[PDB]
Enzyme design. Structure first.
Site, mmCIF file in Angstrom:
data_model
loop_
_atom_site.group_PDB
_atom_site.id
_atom_site.type_symbol
_atom_site.label_atom_id
_atom_site.label_comp_id
_atom_site.label_asym_id
_atom_site.label_seq_id
_atom_site.Cartn_x
_atom_site.Cartn_y
_atom_site.Cartn_z
ATOM 1 N N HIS A 61 0.842 -1.242 0.000
ATOM 2 C CA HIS A 61 0.000 0.000 0.000
ATOM 3 C C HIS A 61 0.861 1.270 0.000
ATOM 4 O O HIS A 61 0.307 2.352 -0.285
ATOM 5 C CB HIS A 61 -1.056 0.074 1.126
ATOM 6 C CG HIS A 61 -0.593 -0.028 2.546
ATOM 7 N ND1 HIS A 61 -0.305 1.089 3.351
ATOM 8 C CD2 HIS A 61 -0.451 -1.107 3.342
ATOM 9 C CE1 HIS A 61 0.043 0.676 4.544
ATOM 10 N NE2 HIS A 61 -0.030 -0.663 4.561
ATOM 11 N N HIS A 91 6.239 6.944 6.080
ATOM 12 C CA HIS A 91 5.784 6.477 4.763
ATOM 13 C C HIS A 91 5.171 7.658 4.031
ATOM 14 O O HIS A 91 5.104 8.745 4.603
ATOM 15 C CB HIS A 91 4.769 5.353 4.904
ATOM 16 C CG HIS A 91 3.537 5.825 5.580
ATOM 17 N ND1 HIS A 91 3.334 5.652 6.925
ATOM 18 C CD2 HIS A 91 2.481 6.498 5.100
ATOM 19 C CE1 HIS A 91 2.178 6.226 7.235
ATOM 20 N NE2 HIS A 91 1.614 6.722 6.130
ATOM 21 N N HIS A 93 2.195 9.016 0.812
ATOM 22 C CA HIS A 93 1.042 8.850 -0.080
ATOM 23 C C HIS A 93 1.324 9.737 -1.290
ATOM 24 O O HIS A 93 1.803 10.861 -1.071
ATOM 25 C CB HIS A 93 -0.273 9.220 0.600
ATOM 26 C CG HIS A 93 -0.488 8.507 1.899
ATOM 27 N ND1 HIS A 93 -1.255 7.360 1.960
ATOM 28 C CD2 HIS A 93 -0.033 8.736 3.140
ATOM 29 C CE1 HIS A 93 -1.254 6.922 3.219
ATOM 30 N NE2 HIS A 93 -0.488 7.736 3.954
ATOM 31 N N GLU A 103 -3.280 13.412 1.194
ATOM 32 C CA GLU A 103 -4.482 12.938 1.909
ATOM 33 C C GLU A 103 -5.179 14.157 2.483
ATOM 34 O O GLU A 103 -6.334 14.403 2.134
ATOM 35 C CB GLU A 103 -4.045 11.935 2.967
ATOM 36 C CG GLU A 103 -3.453 10.684 2.339
ATOM 37 C CD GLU A 103 -3.656 9.424 3.130
ATOM 38 O OE1 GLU A 103 -3.266 9.399 4.290
ATOM 39 O OE2 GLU A 103 -4.262 8.471 2.562
ATOM 40 N N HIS A 116 4.099 11.014 6.157
ATOM 41 C CA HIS A 116 3.566 10.741 7.508
ATOM 42 C C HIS A 116 4.663 10.116 8.372
ATOM 43 O O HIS A 116 5.169 9.037 8.012
ATOM 44 C CB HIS A 116 2.393 9.787 7.409
ATOM 45 C CG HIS A 116 1.202 10.442 6.812
ATOM 46 N ND1 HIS A 116 0.138 9.729 6.260
ATOM 47 C CD2 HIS A 116 0.921 11.755 6.663
ATOM 48 C CE1 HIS A 116 -0.726 10.617 5.789
ATOM 49 N NE2 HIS A 116 -0.297 11.845 6.059
ATOM 50 N N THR A 195 -5.455 6.494 8.251
ATOM 51 C CA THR A 195 -6.057 6.741 6.920
ATOM 52 C C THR A 195 -6.069 5.451 6.097
ATOM 53 O O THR A 195 -6.511 5.525 4.948
ATOM 54 C CB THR A 195 -5.387 7.903 6.190
ATOM 55 O OG1 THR A 195 -4.115 7.426 5.799
ATOM 56 C CG2 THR A 195 -5.287 9.150 7.044
ATOM 57 N N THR A 196 -5.537 4.346 6.624
ATOM 58 C CA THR A 196 -5.749 3.004 6.009
ATOM 59 C C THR A 196 -6.458 2.132 7.033
ATOM 60 O O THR A 196 -6.365 2.372 8.250
ATOM 61 C CB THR A 196 -4.442 2.314 5.595
ATOM 62 O OG1 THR A 196 -3.798 1.798 6.769
ATOM 63 C CG2 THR A 196 -3.525 3.237 4.828
HETATM 64 C C1 VQH Z 1 0.640 -2.626 12.776
HETATM 65 C C2 VQH Z 1 -0.800 -2.111 12.983
HETATM 66 C C3 VQH Z 1 -1.646 -2.152 11.775
HETATM 67 C C4 VQH Z 1 -1.149 -1.147 10.763
HETATM 68 C C5 VQH Z 1 -0.985 0.290 11.381
HETATM 69 C C6 VQH Z 1 -0.192 0.324 12.627
HETATM 70 C C7 VQH Z 1 -0.457 1.675 13.230
HETATM 71 C C8 VQH Z 1 -0.295 2.746 12.257
HETATM 72 C C9 VQH Z 1 -0.178 2.605 10.908
HETATM 73 C C10 VQH Z 1 0.001 3.779 10.072
HETATM 74 C C11 VQH Z 1 -1.109 3.807 8.997
HETATM 75 O O1 VQH Z 1 -1.014 4.997 8.009
HETATM 76 S S1 VQH Z 1 -1.409 6.402 8.393
HETATM 77 N N1 VQH Z 1 -1.662 7.091 7.082
HETATM 78 O O2 VQH Z 1 -2.700 6.270 9.097
HETATM 79 O O3 VQH Z 1 -0.324 7.016 9.211
HETATM 80 C C12 VQH Z 1 -1.028 2.531 8.257
HETATM 81 C C13 VQH Z 1 -1.390 1.418 9.217
HETATM 82 C C14 VQH Z 1 -0.387 1.331 10.339
HETATM 83 C C15 VQH Z 1 0.976 0.822 9.750
HETATM 84 C C16 VQH Z 1 -0.835 -0.755 13.556
HETATM 85 C C17 VQH Z 1 -0.133 -0.931 14.954
HETATM 86 C C18 VQH Z 1 -0.783 -2.254 15.417
HETATM 87 C C19 VQH Z 1 -1.496 -2.877 14.178
HETATM 88 C C20 VQH Z 1 -1.405 -4.409 14.017
HETATM 89 O O4 VQH Z 1 -0.561 -5.044 14.641
HETATM 90 ZN ZN ZN Z 2 -0.122 7.773 5.951
#
Ligand code: VQH
Ligand code: ZN
Length: 257
Positions: A61, A91, A93, A103, A116, A195-196
């Site tokens: 993504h 990361h 976008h 975004e 971000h 945002t995902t």
């Molecule tokens: C790894 C996790 C799922 C993915 C989560 C992460 C927390 C923050 C982000 C940042 C987000 O992007 S953004 N745009 O919102 O900053 C994309 C998803 C992600 C990587 C979670 C922490 C715990 C969870 C599962 O174990």
């Molecule tokens: Zn992001």
């Protein structure tokens, strides 16, 4: 299963993640004339001198640079925050063309891309616990416009050929994220979400007013990444942005007059 395409994109996400239609979703349009100057908001404290980057990863993504978050080495404090937030990863976008990719938008203006830097609140001990809390995460958002090259981004651009497809990773040590910051730390802030998926409502958003400039050659390299795994039809990794969501009952605050 989720992605950014016609059949799995942001308009579909609510089916697996019903919080997609929640009360504090991100991103949002920042209406600069409606955002309230808050003289109570403190300067943002960015302490990245001891940052330890580990890996760069294509997660299907985006791509992310991951940091050692096992100690207070790269931390965000002050601004609208209570306590100490550790840097987990950054990361981006971006768009298929320079007129879209961010975004957040500013008076409906879309930037070519958005950086971000994701931090989590040390009072919750780990990021998995932090995403379950309304003040668990702080994400520092920086707009990219296309013009002059950002020298501090070039180390990232030069390794993207090695992580072209999803799950590919590489060593990415001794990267200094201070090289990605604009001069001013003037910001807007509001309570929002990831945002995902899973779109968790755990984020204090801090969006810097000043964009960084990147070159056309730097952003072209982002657009050569692939959403697909090696050997799959594939599909350029472009337009990996969620559109602006309803502000509902929220106030965007400005740190500046
Ligand atoms: C790894 C996790 C799922 C993915 C989560 C992460 C927390 C923050 C982000 C940042 C987000 O992007 S953004 N745009 O919102 O900053 C994309 C998803 C992600 C990587 C979670 C922490 C715990 C969870 C599962 O174990
Ligand atoms: Zn992001």
């Amino acid at each position: 299963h989720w992605g950014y395409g016609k059949h799995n994109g942001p308009e579909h996400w609510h089916k697996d993640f019903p919080i997609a239609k929640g009360e504090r979703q991100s991103p949002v349009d920042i209406d600069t004339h409606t955002a309230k100057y808050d003289p109570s908001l403190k300067p943002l404290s960015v302490s990245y001198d001891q940052a330890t980057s580990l890996r760069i990863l294509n997660n299907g993504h985006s791509f992310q640079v991951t940091f050692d978050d096992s100690q207070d080495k790269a931390v965000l404090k002050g601004g609208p925050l209570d306590g100490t937030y550790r840097l987990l990863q950054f990361h981006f976008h971006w768009g298929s063309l320079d007129g879209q990719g961010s975004e957040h938008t500013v008076d409906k203006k879309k930037y070519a891309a958005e950086l971000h830097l994701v931090h989590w609140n040390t009072k919750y001990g780990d990021v998995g616990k932090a995403v379950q809390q309304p003040d668990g995460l702080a994400v520092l958002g920086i707009f990219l416009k296309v013009g002059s090259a950002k020298p501090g981004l070039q180390k990232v651009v030069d390794v993207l050929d090695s992580i072209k497809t999803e799950g590919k990773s590489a060593d990415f040590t001794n990267f200094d994220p201070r090289g990605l910051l604009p001069e001013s730390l003037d910001y807007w802030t509001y309570p929002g979400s990831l945002t995902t998926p899973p779109l968790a409502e755990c984020v204090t958003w801090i969006v810097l007013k000043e964009p960084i400039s990147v070159s056309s050659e730097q952003v072209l390299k982002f657009r050569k990444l692939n959403f697909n795994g090696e050997g799959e039809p594939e599909e350029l990794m472009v337009d990996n942005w969620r559109p602006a969501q309803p502000l509902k009952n929220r106030q965007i605050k400005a740190s500046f007059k």
